[PDB]
Design a binder for this molecule. Structure first.
Ligand SMILES: *SC1C=CC(OC)C=C1
Length: 259
């Protein structure tokens, strides 16, 4: 009947302007309100933020707008002995201190088929891309950068689609940067370098050149932003895991502490 929290990002990390604070618990939290009250977030410079739950075990906190570069963030999860409902008690306190690095925002525009990277306002890179083909389009929205992989075997069964079923796949991929928990990545796509900038051919990922994918791997960090615009797809869910910013501030602020 004890639940331990885990906070992200990790102590000492430098993260991009889209990185929310994340407190994950190893058990469903009955009393979200108690959990929220136990978590103190301090920022310098000070900015307003708010909690919103992505599922029964993980709550997120972020501001209305992307963080200002340079901001220092302190999180104290003071859950030791707190009654979190249905007879579950916080097993422990946890903490983290982190800082916000440079503003890196990349936009993938399906009308141009170009992924442009802006660092602190200025364009530093302009990569042709090939996104989701019309029958499996890439969703528009704001994506937060997660993990990066030098090499990875991309397998659709990970995400509930059998490899040998119509939209299935299993492929070795290089220089992959994760941007949704649903399995969207910016990655090396040596096969479609002729289609990149012209035609969408993917299952939903952002195909770029091997060298552009390596650059993206090397120069993006956790919490940087990728925005996809003008596709024929839907909208990344706000509760994806990396889709937090697609929930409008009015709704995020109001929260969901009583659900
Ligand atoms: S992210 C991704 C998904 C499928 C691929 O090719 C089968 C490549 C990348």
């Amino acid at each position: 009947h004890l639940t331990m929290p885990y906070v992200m990002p990790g102590d000492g990390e430098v993260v991009g302007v889209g990185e929310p604070v994340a407190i994950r618990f190893d058990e469903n939290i009955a009393d979200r309100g108690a959990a929220e009250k136990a978590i103190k977030i301090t920022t310098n410079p000070p900015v307003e933020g708010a909690f919103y739950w992505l599922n029964n075990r993980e709550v997120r906190w972020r501001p209305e707008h992307f963080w200002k570069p340079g901001t220092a963030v302190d999180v104290a999860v003071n859950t030791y002995g707190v009654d979190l409902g249905e007879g579950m008690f916080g097993e422990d306190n946890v903490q983290t201190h982190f800082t916000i690095g440079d503003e890196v925002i990349a936009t993938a525009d399906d009308n141009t088929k170009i992924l442009t990277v802006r660092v602190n306002g200025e364009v530093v890179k302009s990569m042709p891309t090939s996104m989701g083909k019309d029958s499996t389009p890439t969703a528009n929205g704001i994506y937060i950068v997660g993990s990066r992989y030098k090499h990875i075997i991309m397998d659709s069964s990970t995400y509930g689609v059998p490899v040998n079923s119509p939209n299935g796949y299993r492929t070795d991929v290089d220089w992959a940067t994760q941007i949704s928990y649903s399995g969207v990545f910016v990655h090396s796509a040596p096969w479609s370098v002729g289609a990149q900038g012209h035609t969408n051919t993917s299952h939903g990922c952002l195909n770029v050149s091997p060298s552009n994918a390596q650059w993206f791997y090397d120069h993006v960090k956790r919490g940087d932003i990728v925005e996809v615009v003008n596709t024929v797809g839907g909208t990344l869910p706000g509760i994806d895991g990396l889709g937090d910013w697609n929930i409008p501030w009015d709704q995020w602020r109001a929260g969901n502490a009583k659900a």
